[PDB]
């Protein structure tokens, strides 16, 4: 289509048509583990890990998330895991990695996605210390666009943080980690996310909506620009007490416009929180701090990234930490058939 | 400094999600 052919509204309307087709009729069982060569573990977690793999028939590199069915069950993440796969196989956006393949075997669930060789934003943010406002703004813009997309599909994302933002070969980002994402038109109630990034209404055990994502954006922008988050302590409980008060202090190097944006994102009052008002996302996109961002150019990936990863070949993993490599064991007996029937 | 207090904290590494 032409670059000015459609409004954002029209573009998002057509994107929803595309999404709903796939949402209503999900792809299932589209590869097998023996089609991939396992190269390296890129991350680990409580019920899963992510590996760099090579698809043998194409030589393409992918990230493959491997979930142990029994562990997903023990941790009560069955419905959340079904959500993740159903959503990721249906989405399509420049800053998301949709599923290229998914499948399961007796023991595990597998989701295969475009590989992001730049590593986690977390790694770079901690090492460098903090990002300049233009640098933080460039990342933030991509999240604003991605949330507008996600939210227009009635999706809530619910785990924004630097650990869950992957940097690609051109220095743009991928919003990964859809484990808590959910398609919901009403309010919802699950206590989930990461302590530092939780909106007060989640902590106060209120029903909540997509406004929690916009609060989390405020937390991210603060952390990217300051080098530490707005609410931290050694223990989660102390972090929660800080959030519910919502008292924040800005570094003296923060610009006036940054502070003002953050005051409107980190707003405890839902009737005042940017992203949650009559005008929706446009209150964010039209804020003075974003006055210089070319939303159209960012979407088209036309803007030169402020930081472009070191890249020494298509399956390079130098931007990742090293993790202990564990076997992928497949039982001879089918585990959790019923629970993951639709996967 | 706030930076120093952060770096001395136990939450500068990768943060785990929470779950009810
Ligand atoms: N003219 C509509 C679009 C566009 C679509 C295709 C092409 Cl080739 C160019 C432009 C403008 C840039 N995008 C967005 N702009 C502003 N806000 C957004 N929120 C989500 C997407 C966009 C995406 C939609
Ligand atoms: N939250 C960061 C990670 C992750 C780490 C551990 C676990 Cl158990 C889950 C997720 C996101 C997926 N990964 C990706 N790495 C590289 N390229 C990718 N493309 C899509 C996802 C990833 C690896 C890093
Ligand atoms: Cl992921």
């Amino acid at each position: 289509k032409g670059s000015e052919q459609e409004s954002v509204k029209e573009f998002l309307a057509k994107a929803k048509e595309d999404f709903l087709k796939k949402w209503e009729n999900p792809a299932q069982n589209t590869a097998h583990l023996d089609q991939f060569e396992r190269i390296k573990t890129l991350g680990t977690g409580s019920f899963g890990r992510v590996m760099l793999v090579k698809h043998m028939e194409t030589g393409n590199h992918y990230a493959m998330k491997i979930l142990d069915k029994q562990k997903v069950v023990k941790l009560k993440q069955i419905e959340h895991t079904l959500n993740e796969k159903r959503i990721l196989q249906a989405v399509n956006f420049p800053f998301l990695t949709k599923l290229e393949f998914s499948f399961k075997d007796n023991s595990n669930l597998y989701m295969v996605m475009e590989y992001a060789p730049g590593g986690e934003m977390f790694s770079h943010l901690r090492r460098i210390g903090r990002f300049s406002e233009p640098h933080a703004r460039f990342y933030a813009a991509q999240i604003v666009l991605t949330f507008e997309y996600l939210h227009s599909l009635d999706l809530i994302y619910r785990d924004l943080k630097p650990e869950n933002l992957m940097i690609d070969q051109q220095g743009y980002i991928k919003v990964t980690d859809f484990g808590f994402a959910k398609r919901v038109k009403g309010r919802t109630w699950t206590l989930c996310g990461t302590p530092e990034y939780l909106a007060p209404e989640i902590i106060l055990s209120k029903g909540y909506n997509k406004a929690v994502d916009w609060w989390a954006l405020g937390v991210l922008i603060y952390e990217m620009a300051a080098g530490y988050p707005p609410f931290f302590a050694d223990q989660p409980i102390q972090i929660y007490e800080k959030i519910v008060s919502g008292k924040v202090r800005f570094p003296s190097h923060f610009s006036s416009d940054l502070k003002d944006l953050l005051r409107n994102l980190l707003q405890v009052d839902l009737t005042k929180r940017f992203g949650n008002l009559k005008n929706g996302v446009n209150d964010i996109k039209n804020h003075k701090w974003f006055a210089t961002t070319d939303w159209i150019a960012i979407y088209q990936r036309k803007v030169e990234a402020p930081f472009i990863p070191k890249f020494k070949g298509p399956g390079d993993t130098s931007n990742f930490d090293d993790y202990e490599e564990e076997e992928i064991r497949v039982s001879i007996n089918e585990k959790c058939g019923k629970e993951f029937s639709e996967f | 400094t706030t930076y120093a207090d952060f770096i001395a904290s136990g939450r500068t590494g990768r943060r785990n999600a929470i779950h009810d």
Side-chain angles (χ1 to χ4, degrees):
Chain A
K1 301 195 191 302
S3 70
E4 292 283 346
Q5 176 181 325
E6 292 179 337
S7 64
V8 166
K9 192 190 170 218
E10 289 172 317
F11 161 83
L12 290 181
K14 293 287 188 273
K16 200 166 180 160
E17 290 175 9
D18 294 342
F19 171 85
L20 290 176
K21 277 176 207 141
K22 292 189 174 161
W23 171 259
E24 290 302 339
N25 190 26
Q28 171 172 43
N29 193 42
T30 62
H32 183 291
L33 183 64
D34 67 11
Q35 295 165 352
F36 298 94
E37 171 192 341
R38 266 101 78 205
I39 295 167
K40 184 166 215 293
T41 295
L42 298 173
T44 57
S46 279
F47 53 88
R49 62 203 134 154
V50 177
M51 302 194 64
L52 173 71
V53 302
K54 192 166 81 175
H55 185 59
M56 289 166 245
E57 47 207 311
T58 63
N60 288 338
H61 289 92
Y62 294 111
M64 180 183 280
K65 191 167 174 176
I66 306 159
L67 306 183
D68 178 321
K69 285 186 269 187
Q70 298 183 312
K71 297 187 176 183
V72 172
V73 172
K74 274 181 173 294
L75 287 163
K76 305 200 294 186
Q77 296 306 304
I78 302 160
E79 194 70 34
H80 285 163
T81 295
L82 295 183
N83 287 338
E84 174 173 17
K85 179 262 170 171
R86 198 172 169 187
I87 291 167
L88 281 170
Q89 66 80 43
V91 297
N92 161 232
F93 201 69
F95 319 115
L96 293 178
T97 66
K98 67 177 175 6
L99 301 188
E100 302 303 324
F101 313 93
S102 75
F103 49 95
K104 66 210 175 189
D105 59 28
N106 280 167
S107 293
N108 305 304
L109 311 171
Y110 306 88
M111 288 184 285
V112 182
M113 293 160 292
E114 173 189 354
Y115 174 57
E120 293 171 10
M121 181 194 291
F122 167 87
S123 296
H124 294 98
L125 181 53
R126 291 289 181 273
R127 173 173 185 122
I128 298 302
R130 66 171 171 98
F131 301 154
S132 75
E133 297 194 21
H135 190 164
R137 175 185 294 126
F138 173 77
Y139 295 148
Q142 292 164 70
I143 305 301
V144 171
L145 291 173
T146 302
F147 284 2
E148 177 167 24
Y149 172 83
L150 294 176
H151 293 173
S152 74
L153 302 175
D154 312 295
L155 303 170
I156 199 169
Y157 171 66
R158 301 195 294 189
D159 207 19
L160 185 65
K161 52 179 167 182
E163 296 95 309
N164 292 356
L165 294 170
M166 299 312 286
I167 302 172
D168 67 27
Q169 194 182 123
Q170 295 79 221
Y172 280 70
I173 58 186
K174 307 294 184 200
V175 184
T176 58
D177 297 274
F178 269 60
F180 294 144
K182 181 181 173 95
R183 197 164 175 241
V184 50
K185 252 144 152 44
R187 62 196 129 181
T188 200
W189 302 267
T190 298
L191 171 65
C192 61
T194 298
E196 286 87 338
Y197 281 76
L198 295 182
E201 64 265 28
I202 302 180
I203 293 161
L204 293 181
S205 212
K206 293 181 180 164
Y208 64 81
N209 65 14
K210 290 170 194 82
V212 303
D213 284 337
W214 297 123
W215 173 281
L217 176 68
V219 180
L220 181 75
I221 294 168
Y222 187 113
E223 187 178 325
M224 289 189 296
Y228 48 83
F231 315 108
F232 69 91
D234 273 342
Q235 298 309 329
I237 179 61
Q238 306 168 285
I239 299 171
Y240 306 143
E241 289 162 10
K242 284 170 182 209
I243 291 164
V244 294
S245 104
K247 286 193 303 189
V248 294
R249 295 171 73 184
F250 302 115
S252 66
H253 70 77
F254 274 23
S255 66
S256 299
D257 288 331
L258 181 47
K259 290 186 287 193
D260 187 74
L261 176 59
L262 294 177
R263 282 181 197 111
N264 287 111
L265 291 172
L266 302 175
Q267 173 56 259
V268 175
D269 188 333
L270 291 166
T271 72
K272 296 181 180 163
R273 189 184 303 159
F274 267 26
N276 204 38
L277 307 184
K278 182 246 189 68
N279 217 329
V281 65
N282 292 96
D283 283 336
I284 297 171
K285 289 202 274 182
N286 295 332
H287 189 280
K288 284 181 192 177
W289 194 71
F290 278 118
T292 63
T293 119
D294 189 341
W295 300 106
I296 295 165
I298 291 283
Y299 172 83
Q300 296 177 87
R301 310 163 63 80
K302 292 210 290 183
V303 176
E304 189 175 331
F307 161 65
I308 291 149
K310 270 178 143 179
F311 176 81
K312 321 153 175 53
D316 175 56
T317 59
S318 65
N319 299 303
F320 288 83
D321 289 322
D322 301 313
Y323 292 88
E324 181 194 6
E325 303 289 343
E326 155 183 282
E327 58 164 12
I328 302 181
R329 213 189 73 89
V330 186
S331 176
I332 63 170
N333 299 293
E334 181 183 57
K335 273 53 177 298
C336 313
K338 175 77 169 58
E339 293 95 331
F340 300 102
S341 171
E342 77 174 44
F343 189 105
Chain B
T1 67
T2 307
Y3 164 78
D5 290 334
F6 183 58
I7 293 300
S9 82
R11 294 186 70 88
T12 69
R14 299 188 164 81
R15 296 153 298 194
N16 298 324
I18 56 79
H19 40 11
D20 54 15

